[PDB]
Amino acid sequence: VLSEGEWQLVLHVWAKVEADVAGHGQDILIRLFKSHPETLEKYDRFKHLKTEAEMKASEDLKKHGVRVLTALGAILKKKGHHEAELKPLAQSHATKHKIPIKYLEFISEAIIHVLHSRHPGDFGADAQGAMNKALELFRKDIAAKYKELGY
Numbered sequence: 001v002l003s004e005g006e007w008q009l010v011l012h013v014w015a016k017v018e019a020d021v022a023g024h025g026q027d028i029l030i031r032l033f034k035s036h037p038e039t040l041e042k043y044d045r046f047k048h049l050k051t052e053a054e055m056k057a058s059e060d061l062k063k064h065g066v067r068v069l070t071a072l073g074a075i076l077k078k079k080g081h082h083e084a085e086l087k088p089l090a091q092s093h094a095t096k097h098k099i100p101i102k103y104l105e106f107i108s109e110a111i112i113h114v115l116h117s118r119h120p121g122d123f124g125a126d127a128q129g130a131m132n133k134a135l136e137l138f139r140k141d142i143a144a145k146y147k148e149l150g151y
């Protein structure tokens, strides 16, 4: 569980992401694709992009990153009480996009990577631990929803 204090560490650094949602989204997606090229291959809409220059030039990829971080921001602001936000996400990702649960672990690592790179002053050991726990709770609730939907 996170304490209220730990939720504040999470929402404090998230307010730094919210200063530049689009730029953070691009850095996280590019990090994910570089770390785990199987993830890009699974994105029919984006799999054409072959290089980092092409990825940073894609307005579609940029708008997608904004959707992702907007949805995740709304989830984190619920401080674990995200059942309602998770339902449509689990539904689309299990049954429509067919995203393997492991990919949610990979994007969590990519989020930690970018937060650390851009906000080290707001991402000390306690803030890193709090964000890891918040994303782990998210991933595990999605995993349980995946299984409930038969995926």
Ligand code: HEM
Residues within 6 Å of the ligand: 039, 040, 042, 043, 044, 045, 064, 067, 068, 069, 071, 072, 088, 089, 092, 093, 097, 099, 103, 104, 107
């Ligand atoms: C924090 C984790 C995630 C959040 C909050 C998130 C959120 C979203 C949202 C809000 C959309 C548009 C609405 C919808 O279809 O549900 C979406 C679409 C999609 N997402 Fe995720 N998502 C994440 C994890 C992933 C991962 C790990 C991948 C890697 C393949 C992924 C790829 C998919 C794809 C392929 C679409 C459709 C994009 C398109 O072609 O328009 N997402 N996501």
